[PDB]
Design an enzyme around this catalytic site. Sequence first.
Site, mmCIF file in Angstrom:
data_model
loop_
_atom_site.group_PDB
_atom_site.id
_atom_site.type_symbol
_atom_site.label_atom_id
_atom_site.label_comp_id
_atom_site.label_asym_id
_atom_site.label_seq_id
_atom_site.Cartn_x
_atom_site.Cartn_y
_atom_site.Cartn_z
ATOM 1 N N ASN A 1 6.701 -26.909 -20.713
ATOM 2 C CA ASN A 1 5.756 -26.943 -19.525
ATOM 3 C C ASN A 1 6.657 -26.436 -18.331
ATOM 4 O O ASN A 1 6.808 -27.286 -17.227
ATOM 5 C CB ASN A 1 5.200 -28.394 -19.274
ATOM 6 C CG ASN A 1 3.951 -28.383 -18.433
ATOM 7 O OD1 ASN A 1 3.530 -27.174 -18.053
ATOM 8 N ND2 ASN A 1 3.744 -29.636 -17.850
ATOM 9 N N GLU B 1 6.081 -22.305 -23.207
ATOM 10 C CA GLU B 1 5.683 -22.249 -21.741
ATOM 11 C C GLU B 1 6.790 -22.390 -20.777
ATOM 12 O O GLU B 1 7.018 -23.318 -19.854
ATOM 13 C CB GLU B 1 4.637 -23.664 -21.524
ATOM 14 C CG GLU B 1 3.354 -23.310 -21.811
ATOM 15 C CD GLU B 1 2.426 -24.131 -20.967
ATOM 16 O OE1 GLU B 1 2.131 -23.950 -19.930
ATOM 17 O OE2 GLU B 1 1.793 -24.838 -21.765
ATOM 18 N N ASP C 1 3.280 -24.404 -30.431
ATOM 19 C CA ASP C 1 2.247 -24.988 -29.897
ATOM 20 C C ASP C 1 0.856 -24.542 -30.503
ATOM 21 O O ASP C 1 0.484 -23.339 -29.783
ATOM 22 C CB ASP C 1 2.090 -25.056 -28.551
ATOM 23 C CG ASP C 1 1.132 -25.901 -27.513
ATOM 24 O OD1 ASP C 1 0.169 -26.235 -28.393
ATOM 25 O OD2 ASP C 1 1.277 -26.444 -26.408
ATOM 26 N N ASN D 1 -2.130 -25.662 -30.144
ATOM 27 C CA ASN D 1 -3.145 -26.238 -29.579
ATOM 28 C C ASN D 1 -4.360 -26.879 -30.038
ATOM 29 O O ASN D 1 -5.355 -26.712 -29.548
ATOM 30 C CB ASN D 1 -3.588 -25.088 -28.310
ATOM 31 C CG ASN D 1 -3.069 -25.199 -26.984
ATOM 32 O OD1 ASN D 1 -3.059 -26.425 -26.316
ATOM 33 N ND2 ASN D 1 -2.557 -24.123 -26.537
ATOM 34 N N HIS E 1 4.502 -32.356 -23.491
ATOM 35 C CA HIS E 1 4.747 -32.202 -24.989
ATOM 36 C C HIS E 1 6.192 -32.799 -25.036
ATOM 37 O O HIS E 1 7.053 -32.997 -24.230
ATOM 38 C CB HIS E 1 4.883 -30.893 -25.416
ATOM 39 C CG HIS E 1 3.579 -30.148 -25.445
ATOM 40 N ND1 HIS E 1 2.719 -29.840 -26.437
ATOM 41 C CD2 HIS E 1 2.834 -29.583 -24.165
ATOM 42 C CE1 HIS E 1 1.774 -29.159 -25.954
ATOM 43 N NE2 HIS E 1 1.659 -28.982 -24.736
#
EC number: 4.2.99.18
Lengths: 254, 255
Positions: B12, B38, B151, B153, B248
């Site tokens: 992130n 990310e 990820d 999702n 995360h």
Amino acid sequence: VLKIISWNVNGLRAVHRKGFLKWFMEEKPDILCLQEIKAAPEQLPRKLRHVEGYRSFFTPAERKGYSGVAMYTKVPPSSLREGFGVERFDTEGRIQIADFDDFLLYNIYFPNGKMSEERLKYKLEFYDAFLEDVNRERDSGRNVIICGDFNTAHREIDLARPKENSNVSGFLPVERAWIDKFIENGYVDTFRMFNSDPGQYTWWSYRTRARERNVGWRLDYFFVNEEFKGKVKRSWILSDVMGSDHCPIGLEIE
Amino acid sequence: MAVLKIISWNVNGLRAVHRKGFLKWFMEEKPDILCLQEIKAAPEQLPRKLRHVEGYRSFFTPAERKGYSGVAMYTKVPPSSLREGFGVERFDTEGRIQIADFDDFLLYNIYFPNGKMSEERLKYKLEFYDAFLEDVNRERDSGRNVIICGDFNTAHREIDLARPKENSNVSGFLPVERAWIDKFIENGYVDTFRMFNSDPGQYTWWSYRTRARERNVGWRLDYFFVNEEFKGKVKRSWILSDVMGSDHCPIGLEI
DNA sequence: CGTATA
DNA sequence: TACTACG
Ligand SMILES: [Mg+2]
Ligand SMILES: [Mg+2]
């Protein structure tokens, strides 16, 4: 007797939440020019997309939530050009050229140059493309009105802190020169026709809470070609209306 | 074969975790490979201290869109090659795909699209899912062994998120999305974590809004998958819940 | 809530 | 200091 208003609105959805429509109801302009709408039409509430008595034109940037200009007009233009015909300058939402016969009306959001060398270059090249375009039209015989956010204070009187910002984009010598050149090509800063006072600003930084201290810059202008200078009866700053880091400016003609 | 350590983490914002001591953690945990999703940066925007880490070769795959998406891989041992897309333009230009050949295995580092904001994005997600399957199947069919991390999702089963009923209509636990994982697994791939742990309340992502992480109201969105033929080699597959810095947490794999 | 161009 | 995007 035509009233035109220009305003860098800093997010149309944002000013809407601060009662933009109410102000727009109260002030009844014949044309409203907006810069930094920061939205695609589809993202806009229906009350903003259409407003009683006006025809609305939106020119968003390809990039989502960036730039963008809008025009509201009580009387439709013959046409509306959305670019200079040069791809790089045309896809950011910066250009509205509206033909009202008597005059073309330029609604422009000129690039801010603060974040990078390459953006400052983009700004000056935009400046250039703009001049060619407006000259081509005035040379062809047309009267021109140019409003919008120029992103530059021309003279030291035009900003509160001229010395500190002599190296800041927005008061660079290169930038002020271009306005000089612009004016030399036969165009007048209509505000300066009626007012020669200092401390007349259109933008104030958010960071400092500068607006209450009145530590601003004049970045927003109405320009006309000199042949048309006769028709401008008023050119003022509506510095009392809040909702954006810029305030709106006003022009009255005939 | 023996003693290989891989970590996957949706970070992130790489610049963001850096400011929270990412490098320190990276020194402590010594993985042989570190996969990130990310990163939200182009390499040029990254501090030199991050582009060059002692003992590692670093690969960055940013999105065309500035500060959006992006994946990175740090590896102690170089791959033979590094493919950055599936060969389909729309899926390749967001910073989502790193396929690294380590001979023994291909290693897929993927940031799969979030589907919450629009119908059209949810559609993009499922079509990504599809393109992904074709790709990984071609390679596995050609004989290659494959590790897939990232990820996803989507939580798979009801035990995969704390609040399954309220979110049955929320993207990330839609029936269409869980069906795809089902199908994915049916094509001969294994959720390495589920091999070693069948407990509930094992999550990898928690919403920021609720301060959900201290309440442990999470989802498992981050997975290590292998093709089943390779299942023999996986000795461990765990969740590093200990580690802060992102919405995360990182997950781990040992082969 | 949080990360990332005026 | 703010508006916007996207998570
Ligand atoms: Mg602004
Ligand atoms: Mg995230």
